[PDB]
Amino acid sequence: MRIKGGKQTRVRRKKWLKQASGSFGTRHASYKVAKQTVIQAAKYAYRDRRNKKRDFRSLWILRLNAALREQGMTYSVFINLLKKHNIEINRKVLSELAIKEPSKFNLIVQKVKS
Amino acid sequence: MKVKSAAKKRFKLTKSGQIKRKHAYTSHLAPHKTTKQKRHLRKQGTVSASDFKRIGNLI
Amino acid sequence: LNQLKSVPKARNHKTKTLGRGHGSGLGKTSGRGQKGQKARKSGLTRPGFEGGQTPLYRRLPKFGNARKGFLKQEWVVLNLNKIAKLKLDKINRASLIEKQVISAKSQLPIKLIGHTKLEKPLHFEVHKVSKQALKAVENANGSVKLLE
Amino acid sequence: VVNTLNTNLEQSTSNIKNVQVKHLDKVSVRDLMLANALLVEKEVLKALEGKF
RNA sequence: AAAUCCAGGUACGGGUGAAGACACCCGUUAGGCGCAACGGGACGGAAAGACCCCGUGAAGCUUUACUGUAGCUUAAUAUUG
RNA sequence: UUGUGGUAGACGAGCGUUGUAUUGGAGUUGAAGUCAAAGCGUGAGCAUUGGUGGAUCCAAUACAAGUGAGAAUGCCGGCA
RNA sequence: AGGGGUGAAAUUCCAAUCGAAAUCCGUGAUAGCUGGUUCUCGUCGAAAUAGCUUUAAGGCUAGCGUGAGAUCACAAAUAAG
RNA sequence: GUGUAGUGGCGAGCGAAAGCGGAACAGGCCAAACUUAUCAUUAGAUAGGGGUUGUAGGGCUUGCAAUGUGGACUUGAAAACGAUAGAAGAAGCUGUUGGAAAGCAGCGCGCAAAAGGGUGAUAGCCCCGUAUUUGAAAUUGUUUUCAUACCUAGCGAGAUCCCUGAGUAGCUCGGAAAACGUUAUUUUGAGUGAAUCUGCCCAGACCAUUGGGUAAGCCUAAAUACUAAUUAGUGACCGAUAGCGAAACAGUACCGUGAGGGAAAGGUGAAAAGAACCCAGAGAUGGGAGUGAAAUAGAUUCUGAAACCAUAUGCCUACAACGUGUCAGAGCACAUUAAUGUGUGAUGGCGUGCGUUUUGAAGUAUGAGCCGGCGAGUUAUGAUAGCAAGCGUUAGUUAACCAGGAGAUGGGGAGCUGUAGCGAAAGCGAGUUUUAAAAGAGCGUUUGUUUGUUAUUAUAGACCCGAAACGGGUUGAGCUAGUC
RNA sequence: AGUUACUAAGGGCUUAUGGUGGAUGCCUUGGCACUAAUAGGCGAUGAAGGACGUGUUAACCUGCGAUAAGCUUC
Numbered sequence A: 001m002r003i004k005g006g007k008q009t010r011v012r013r014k015k016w017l018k019q020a021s022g023s024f025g026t027r028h029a030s031y032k033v034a035k036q037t038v039i040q041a042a043k044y045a046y047r048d049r050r051n052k053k054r055d056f057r058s059l060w061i062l063r064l065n066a067a068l069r070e071q072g073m074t075y076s077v078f079i080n081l082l083k084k085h086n087i088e089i090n091r092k093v094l095s096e097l098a099i100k101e102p103s104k105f106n107l108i109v110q111k112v113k114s
Numbered sequence B: 001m002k003v004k005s006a007a008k009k010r011f012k013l014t015k016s017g018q019i020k021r022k023h024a025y026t027s028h029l030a031p032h033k034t035t036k037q038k039r040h041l042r043k044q045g046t047v048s049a050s051d052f053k054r055i056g057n058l059i
Numbered sequence C: 001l002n003q004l005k006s007v008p009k010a011r012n013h014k015t016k017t018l019g020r021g022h023g024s025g026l027g028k029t030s031g032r033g034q035k036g037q038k039a040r041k042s043g044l045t046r047p048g049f050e051g052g053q054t055p056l057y058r059r060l061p062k063f064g065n066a067r068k069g070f071l072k073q074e075w076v077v078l079n080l081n082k083i084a085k086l087k088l089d090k091i092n093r094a095s096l097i098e099k100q101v102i103s104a105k106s107q108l109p110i111k112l113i114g115h116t117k118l119e120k121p122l123h124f125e126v127h128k129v130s131k132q133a134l135k136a137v138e139n140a141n142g143s144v145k146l147l148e
Numbered sequence D: 001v002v003n004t005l006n007t008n009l010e011q012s013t014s015n016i017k018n019v020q021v022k023h024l025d026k027v028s029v030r031d032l033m034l035a036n037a038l039l040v041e042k043e044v045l046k047a048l049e050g051k052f
Numbered sequence E: 001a002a003a004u005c006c007a008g009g010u011a012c013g014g015g016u017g018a019a020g021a022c023a024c025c026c027g028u029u030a031g032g033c034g035c036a037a038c039g040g041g042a043c044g045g046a047a048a049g050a051c052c053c054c055g056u057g058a059a060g061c062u063u064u065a066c067u068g069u070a071g072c073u074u075a076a077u078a079u080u081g
Numbered sequence F: 001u002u003g004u005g006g007u008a009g010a011c012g013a014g015c016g017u018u019g020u021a022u023u024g025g026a027g028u029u030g031a032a033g034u035c036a037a038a039g040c041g042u043g044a045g046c047a048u049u050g051g052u053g054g055a056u057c058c059a060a061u062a063c064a065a066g067u068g069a070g071a072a073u074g075c076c077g078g079c080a
Numbered sequence G: 001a002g003g004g005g006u007g008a009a010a011u012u013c014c015a016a017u018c019g020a021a022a023u024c025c026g027u028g029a030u031a032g033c034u035g036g037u038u039c040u041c042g043u044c045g046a047a048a049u050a051g052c053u054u055u056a057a058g059g060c061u062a063g064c065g066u067g068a069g070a071u072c073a074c075a076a077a078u079a080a081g
Numbered sequence H: 001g002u003g004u005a006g007u008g009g010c011g012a013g014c015g016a017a018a019g020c021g022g023a024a025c026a027g028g029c030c031a032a033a034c035u036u037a038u039c040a041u042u043a044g045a046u047a048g049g050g051g052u053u054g055u056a057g058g059g060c061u062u063g064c065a066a067u068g069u070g071g072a073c074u075u076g077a078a079a080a081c082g083a084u085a086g087a088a089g090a091a092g093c094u095g096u097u098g099g100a101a102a103g104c105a106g107c108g109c110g111c112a113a114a115a116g117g118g119u120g121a122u123a124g125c126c127c128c129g130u131a132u133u134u135g136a137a138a139u140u141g142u143u144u145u146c147a148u149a150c151c152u153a154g155c156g157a158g159a160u161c162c163c164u165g166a167g168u169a170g171c172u173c174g175g176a177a178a179a180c181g182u183u184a185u186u187u188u189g190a191g192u193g194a195a196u197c198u199g200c201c202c203a204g205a206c207c208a209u210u211g212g213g214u215a216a217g218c219c220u221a222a223a224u225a226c227u228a229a230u231u232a233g234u235g236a237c238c239g240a241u242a243g244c245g246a247a248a249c250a251g252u253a254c255c256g257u258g259a260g261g262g263a264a265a266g267g268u269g270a271a272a273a274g275a276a277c278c279c280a281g282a283g284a285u286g287g288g289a290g291u292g293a294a295a296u297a298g299a300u301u302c303u304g305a306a307a308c309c310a311u312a313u314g315c316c317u318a319c320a321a322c323g324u325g326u327c328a329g330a331g332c333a334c335a336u337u338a339a340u341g342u343g344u345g346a347u348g349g350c351g352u353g354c355g356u357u358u359u360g361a362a363g364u365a366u367g368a369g370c371c372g373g374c375g376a377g378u379u380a381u382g383a384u385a386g387c388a389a390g391c392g393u394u395a396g397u398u399a400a401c402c403a404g405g406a407g408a409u410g411g412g413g414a415g416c417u418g419u420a421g422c423g424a425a426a427g428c429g430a431g432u433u434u435u436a437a438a439a440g441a442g443c444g445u446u447u448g449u450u451u452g453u454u455a456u457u458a459u460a461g462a463c464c465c466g467a468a469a470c471g472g473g474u475u476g477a478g479c480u481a482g483u484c
Numbered sequence I: 001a002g003u004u005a006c007u008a009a010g011g012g013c014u015u016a017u018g019g020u021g022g023a024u025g026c027c028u029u030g031g032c033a034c035u036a037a038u039a040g041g042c043g044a045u046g047a048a049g050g051a052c053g054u055g056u057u058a059a060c061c062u063g064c065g066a067u068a069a070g071c072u073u074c
Helices: A008-020 A031-071 A075-084 A096-099 A103-113 B005-010 B037-038 B049-056 C080-085 C131-139 D007-011 D029-034 D047-051
Strands: B012-013 B018-024 C076-077 C109-115 C123-128 C143-148
Touching: A008 A031, A031 A075, A031 A096, A075 A103, A096 A103, B018 B049, C080 C123, C080 C131, C109 C123, C109 C131, C131 C143
Parallel strands: C076 C109, C123 C143
Antiparallel strands: B012 B018
8 A cells, every 4th residue: 555644744844843933034944944953053052051051150250250359359369268268158159149239248258357 | 595506515414513525635636745634634624613604504 | 352452472573674764773774884785786795605715615625426316225214212102012014104103105114223122022023123223122022023 | 153054044144244143164263252242052062072 | 038056144364274265263344235347256157077097897990819600612422323 | 880972783662654453432513634822742743722624533452564755966846 | 771871981971969870679788886765762882904806996704893692710801929 | 306316617507307195087090911893903093891009919711799888979859057138126203403414312113135326414214226036039158868960899719821100210420309518318401221010119328138118190178378358346456746658538739750759637516506787997807796504615616735925013133244043131012732921132152054975074075946745675485593382202294286255274194394323325323434443533422393573695677766888670861972 | 422212225033914836635437456257359241440421419529331429120
């Protein structure tokens, strides 16, 4: 018996087309170009799911160091004071949120100087 | 499928799976060899495992 | 059972379909590699064809046949080992056509053979015997008649 | 399951698809378990004993 | 109306790298979109290449290359003393 | 506890398509298809609803395959 | 009228193509060489070495994977002397 | 039997004859001694009878025993079976939905027919028809029965008197079927050339012996291969890029002078009720109206997906160096397969396509315009190995074929595997071969079989697509060249 | 310098609509393969295959054949 592949091809092609939306030119009409765009976007997102956390960590370091320089103490000295003695388990991101609430990070500053 | 007669003539089977053969240089022009070679090549012989696999599917 | 749940005891193997799967399942052209005669159509070189060197069957001498046009004047052998375990006595052709041991539409010569002491008295009728078989059958007071 | 194939069963029971008649030497395992309900005449019950 | 056409919104210098980059890295410069000319490039378009080399490939031709054979020639034999 | 980069390959485990044999079920109170939708999936896939359709399909088990399309300087039909 | 014709003879023509026409069949001609070979998740995971070969893009055996089985400290690696 | 005996650059590859099991199963007729007539019986020719063969027979001369039996066989009649038109052939209402009931629910009925088809949606009882019973003027086919035919008949006694197939077989040189690539066997192009059955040859050279059938003349149904066609049916075959090339007004249009090649193109609706009529425009046409359950049912006529072309809701862009996205991220618009919502994305972080073949590819390597459809690892037979089952400790097991729903299954042990091997073989045997030597060494020291599936593979085009060519048959001198 | 009303000649994204194009799905007046039988040739009394012609019904197809979409017998 001759067997056709009608529904399965259409359903898979429509699903793959639906998987991407918001492309430029004829990158959302053809199945082939849509698959290419999905592959590239997925690989880029795979690398991003690590590069974003790297960049966010760098940004947190930058924004902590900004206030640290404003107070007059270098970032390395502050981390040494946190590590060498006065043991504290404080994420480098949490300290940033303490800067948006005044008198908290200032309290940490007045504490670490002991 | 058709067992080659050229292979059926020079290979006789043996129980448990094996073949027997006569060595070369035995019954031909070889006066330039020692008597040790002559009486060593007289005895029957067998093939290697690789050649056994090669011949087994052909027979 | 009924014809809605019939399933055997886990006997359904897997096949190698070489037409689907670019990187999934099996290879795109499995058992063939790439850039080769074994991969091209009408390949599968001859089993005895090693290609370059002289074939093994041509490098060795041949065993002749001292009986041109003959295999042997075949006669049926009768081992003393297995017959003892079989419940029979006074063995002739008609005895051996009973338990489907010899042909019932043709006749061939019979030769007794083997060496094993008997515990039940039996008498044999064959054309050829053996010395060890002779002493084995004489131990159990058996008899055999030389039949032409 | 009849042994003599009388005309009483041959003439009738040829209209209903669900049920039908068959001789002993013609039945099959697929046909046997396709029934889910069977009637057997006692006459064959000795013969089936002999042949297993 | 056409060949072609992986889609593209399609600058340059230096270096770089499958060894000569519209995209790579570093600098430079540049409103969006047409018009009419000009061929610098996009190793452009046009044909699985005819200054080759492998195919234990084809084709045609040649001679003291092999094996033949048409035809020519000689002998025995039959028609036929 | 060891682990879980990976072609060609080796092996294992599965989906889906058409039809067939029981087995039930759905169907002019609107099935197949189709589009859309801000679902379920470890995967092919599976769903729910809304517009178009006016006649057949779905489920649990095996069976048999012209069975699963991105290239083939491809083929057809249509359109830049 | 094609292992042919015609040729003031260039390999010129023989229905736009002629170093041998076109057409049908043998003929799914052969093709160590091109290109392509489509469902999906899991475990392991190599080579480009040797020998032989009218062999050099090829083909075999061995070395080098994988699956099943066996080897129980005599076995193979990791250390020191 | 068997992939056996063998055959072959002893390579590729080729491959029987026996026997057995089976399907069916009948053997007869001329010439040739003699004999009869007519040929001036010098006839040698035309006819007549007999004789049809080897457990040799026939012919010559005498004897009985019987009109036996068969046909493949001449013509009439009868019987039966049919075939080419046929006929008869049962059983339902009510209600709801719905345009339409035939569905769906309540109560029914027939059924040797609840095979099929059509009927305003999915009918055992609406219809045709289906089981069953049955029918033939004529043309015919088959078998059986009788008679008409044709031909057709068993056993002897004497006796070597005669006959039993001529350019005939072998022989020599060259050719062909036999598995053999030419050897017994058969055939023949050329030369050679006997026997009268007592003899001739056969048994893979050849003679002797042993046994067999009698060569040089003819015919013969039966099992067997096929299907254009008729009739019926069936199909785990196609359902309009498939399947015959042609679902149709296809071998058509067309291509080329010809031979030849060669397509594509089905669907309104329950029924045309196919749009009366009005309006706008010289007109097709469209909008209303009309029929219809429905004009996304309108003759471009089932559904109309994607590439493609425009339209509109909202958002965004005119200092912008970009494999066009990804992650955060402002405003705006809204509010949803009820979700820590979606769409738009001014900005920042990051940045080199997809298969291919390649040591190495974003490439200045190639392939792709896109979308849609079609479009490449099977089957037959045999082998080996794995997985699982039946079976059994003298096993397992069927092939063809007969029986039957173009069904398993029963009947079918023919044969095959293993049950003892060693050796080239004779031959021997738990031993065998080499052997002076049972030394030593090599091989044995019984330990299964048919299946279903999977993997590879042997022959068949054997994963898919792609040559320049070869040979065989055809058609071309109208173009051109030559000749008349 | 800059926030920033109005900007879109045009284009981009999502959504919805219309046309183009007939994929998909339904069935089909037909195709192929076989089973059971029959039958396995026609023909100089003119074949098969064709040309031509025959209409109230043009034209095509079909049937037919100076008796022309047919005639006679049973």
